[PDB]
Amino acid sequence: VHLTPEEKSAVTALWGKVNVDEVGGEALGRLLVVYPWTQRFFESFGDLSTPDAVMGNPKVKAHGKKVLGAFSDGLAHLDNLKGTFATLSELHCDKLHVDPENFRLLGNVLVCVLAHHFGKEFTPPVQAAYQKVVAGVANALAHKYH
């Protein structure tokens, strides 16, 4: 991936400040509310009928934590994003049949969550480094289609 030292610096420092127990679920919840079709994949999660009901859902919060887990794994391995996500690719592509466009959506949603939590600290160049990251991850996660 095309990450420069300065880009690597922006990402890692911000990521150190990330509340990894909540930001993951904050992002999944937002995906479910903003792009409601994605709820099709989470019919077993229980009450998804309102925004408040989605964000306050412990299964969403628990599952987003796992999602964020995978991003953090991505951040230690921008040399081999393809291999790190290969198992997750198999699962989402061959087992779940999630259209890969949704991978870019959740990445963009994450970025919105980061901006929201960090404000002025999520500068345009800081956003730039993070768009390369989520793009990178979305593309690796979609390898089983390519």
Binding site: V33, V34, A115, G119, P124
Partner: protein, 141 residues
């Protein structure tokens, strides 16, 4: 179709942006230019560096177009009609680029309006920007 809840949330958030509307528009553009460099080719004659007067000037004009869309949310096609002609016919702007700028506009609000950017308001803002983008790409001939 934008829901009555959507109109209410968008109105509320734009009201809270207040007089920063222009500065916010400038910042969205820069975010777009940095995050998605392909978009830069529509502005070869702009100086796109940080603090560019032209970017700022454009940030206000773009922000004013959005407030005009908000103020006429029930007839955006009519309100954005000239702008639609400009973006599709003259400039030939790629429909993808409206998604990239919309995302950056969401990021900008998120970064400035901590209280206002709730999951619901985020959803409503997103549909508003998709609606505006639909109108601005309606005139591909």
């Amino acid at each position: 179709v934008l829901s009555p809840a959507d109109k209410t949330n968008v109105k509320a958030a734009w009201g809270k942006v207040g007089a920063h509307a222009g500065e916010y528009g400038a910042e969205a553009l820069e975010r777009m230019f940095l995050s998605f460099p392909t978009t830069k080719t529509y502005f070869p004659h702009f100086d796109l560096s940080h603090g560019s007067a032209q970017v700022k000037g454009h940030g206000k004009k773009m922000a004013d177009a959005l407030t005009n869309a908000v103020a006429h949310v029930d007839d955006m096609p009519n309100a954005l009609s000239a702008l639609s002609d400009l973006h599709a016919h003259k400039l030939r702007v790629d429909p993808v680029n409206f998604k990239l700028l919309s995302h950056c506009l969401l990021v900008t609000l998120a970064a400035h309006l901590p209280a206002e950017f709730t999951p619901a308001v985020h959803a409503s803002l997103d549909k508003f920007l998709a609606s505006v983008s639909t109108v601005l790409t309606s005139k591909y001939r």
